[PDB]
């Protein structure tokens, strides 16, 4: 069965839109699940003794919009109070209520498809024995898939994927590669090199395909406790070419950080 | 002419809201075009032989909200079935239908401003000769302009702009610069240096303005097949200063990767 909503009703009766249908629609438009909120303090909440007064705050919980207009929540002293918006559709006259709780008791209850009380924490209010010491809002999560953007400003941080690889390059050289965003690689040199000539391919493992650059990358390294240096080339095929001086039978400790981009312009 | 919707209609005749007007509003709020969807399986679809039963799935296509409640789609065996939502506004009683097709036949038809049937693929269901082997959803695209965000988590990748520049710095030295996000630069050294003294400005081309740093950047390089190194300074004014030892008539191959930031804290 297909149940249609955003469609015209020729005889004004065909497609009635329920509050739960709009709830689900709104959740989908904003990219919210039942474990987050949309919240806006149009005016600042006021703290008086062990109470928080929401003067003019709008909340969207489970795609349901409501307003807190001079709504006071009594708080527990010397405690971290978790402020919840609770939606119980069976309480027909007053389906929404606020509570101050000892823990984040957000339950992710699907109120738009089934029965149950939705509880969702939106504020954290810390108290002393006399009043509010600090308030921290709960994060409003936007769950999106693929984004096309022109400009972005981040005040906190962006967490991107990280992949790691250890390569036993041969001749005693060990590379520890860390790739972030599938593009930026930082190579950390370890081990001790011996029995190699300039221009020669190293005798060990080639770099795994996911860490191979599109163009040859020359990475400078240093010999620990010496004034001497070397460089290696990570070739697009994964091979590593030695470009330091010829090294004899005696191993020399190799260290240093070198960076490269995997991707070119496109 | 101006057509108003989210406004008071004193006589309940002025600003009635059409389904296409809400469709466009919803598309604008979520940042969707006609080539994507908003989709949520509130309960898991069920696979039975060559059929997919959508138990409780909500879809937004062209800003139009509808629900699939125990709606079964018959599948082609030993095939990759592309599941489509098809919207035909002329079919007033049943404007939405589902189809299983041999290709992604999404047509991007503007149903809110023009005529036509909107076809949009939302699921990919692969079958054997007897039933479903795998299911993959179609990506939900968010087309945005300028974003202000506190924190972000990326599970895939961020694609940022890339600019490249080759500089014939003089004395046989060649720099290949790759700039990403208009900030991070990785310099790759090439060529072979000769006839230069420490502290001397190199005899060739200065770095183009878009690659110039705010502060002097010292980039370490290596001499191929040797245990010797050098460094160059990329000055904010665009000039390059040699800071290796004095080089005679015989050129020595220069290689290595060095990174710098164009922008400081601002």
């Amino acid at each position: 069965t297909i149940k249609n909503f955003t469609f015209f009703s020729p005889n004004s009766t065909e497609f009635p839109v329920g509050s739960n249908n709009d709830g689900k629609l709104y959740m989908m438009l904003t990219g919210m699940d039942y474990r987050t909120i949309r919240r806006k303090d149009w005016s600042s909440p006021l703290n008086t003794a062990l109470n928080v007064q929401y003067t003019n705050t709008s909340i969207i919980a489970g795609g349901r919009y409501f307003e807190l207009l001079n709504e006071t929540v009594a708080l527990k002293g010397d405690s971290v109070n978790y402020i919840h918006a609770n939606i119980d559709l069976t309480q027909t006259a007053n389906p929404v209520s606020l509570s101050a709780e000892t823990a984040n008791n957000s339950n992710g209850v699907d109120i738009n498809n089934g029965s149950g009380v939705l509880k969702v924490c939106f504020d954290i209010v810390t108290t002393s024995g006399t009043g509010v010491t600090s308030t921290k809002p709960i994060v409003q999560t936007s769950t999106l898939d693929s984004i096309s953007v022109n400009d972005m400003t981040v005040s906190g941080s962006i967490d991107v994927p990280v992949q790691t690889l250890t390569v036993e390059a041969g001749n005693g050289l060990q590379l520890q590669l860390t790739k972030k965003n599938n593009d930026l690689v930082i190579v950390r040199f370890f081990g001790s090199v011996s029995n190699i000539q300039k221009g020669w391919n190293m005798s060990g493992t080639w770099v795994d395909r996911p860490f191979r650059p599109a163009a040859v990358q020359s990475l400078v390294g240093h010999f620990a406790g010496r004034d001497t240096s070397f460089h290696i080339d990570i070739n697009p095929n994964g091979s590593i070419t030695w470009w330091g001086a010829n090294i004899d039978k005696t191993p020399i400790a190799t260290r240093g950080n070198g960076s490269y981009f995997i991707k070119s312009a496109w | 002419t101006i057509k108003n919707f989210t406004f008071f209609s004193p006589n309940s005749t002025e600003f009635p809201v059409g389904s296409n007007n809400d469709g466009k509003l919803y598309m604008m709020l979520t940042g969707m075009d006609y080539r994507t969807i908003r989709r949520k399986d509130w309960s898991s679809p069920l696979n039975t032989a060559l059929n997919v039963q959508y138990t409780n799935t909500s879809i937004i296509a062209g800003g139009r909200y509808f629900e699939l409640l125990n709606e079964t789609v018959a599948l082609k065996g030993d095939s990759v079935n592309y599941i489509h939502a098809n919207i035909d506004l002329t079919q007033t009683a049943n404007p939405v239908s589902l189809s299983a097709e041999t290709a992604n036949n999404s047509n991007g038809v503007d149903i809110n401003n023009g005529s036509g049937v909107l076809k949009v693929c939302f699921d990919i269901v692969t079958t054997s000769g007897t039933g479903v082997t795998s299911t993959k959803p179609i990506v939900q695209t968010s087309t945005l302009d300028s974003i202000s965000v506190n924190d972000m988590t990326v599970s895939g990748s961020i694609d940022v702009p890339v600019q490249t520049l080759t500089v014939e710095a003089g004395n046989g030295l060649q720099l290949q610069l790759t700039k990403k996000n208009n900030d991070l630069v990785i310099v790759r050294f090439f060529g072979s240096v000769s006839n230069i003294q420490k502290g001397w400005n190199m005899s060739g081309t200065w770095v183009d303005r878009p690659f110039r740093p705010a502060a002097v950047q010292s980039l370490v390089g290596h001499f191929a097949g040797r245990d010797t190194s050098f460094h160059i300074d990329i000055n904010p004014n665009g000039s390059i200063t040699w800071w290796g030892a004095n080089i005679d008539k015989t050129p020595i191959a220069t290689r290595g990767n060095g990174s710098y930031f164009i922008k400081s804290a601002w």
Partner: nanobody
Amino acid sequence: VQLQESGGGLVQAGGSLRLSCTASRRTGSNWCMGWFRQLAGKEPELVVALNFDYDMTYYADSVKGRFTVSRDSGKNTVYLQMNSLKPEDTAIYYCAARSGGFSSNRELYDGWGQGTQVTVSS
């Protein structure tokens, strides 16, 4: 990939011979073109090679100061001009090409030649 050899033939001890080799394309960075040789029914050895990207040559101790590797400029062509040719150097010279620098391992070479025979009398 594909290689096109030239030169070879006979010459007396203390004489001179020239080898030519052209590669159809380059497989990548650290592009090396050289020759391998199998002397008196023994394992092959990388006699000579040239790193195009670095303009660095490699010569095995046995051929040092006699054999000279040159490149034909812009084209992917390598020449081997050998002087003071001795009867121990009587072997079949196989042209080799690869991306990733010099290597003793035959497998690691992307391009392998048919082989050009060099014969020198006592």
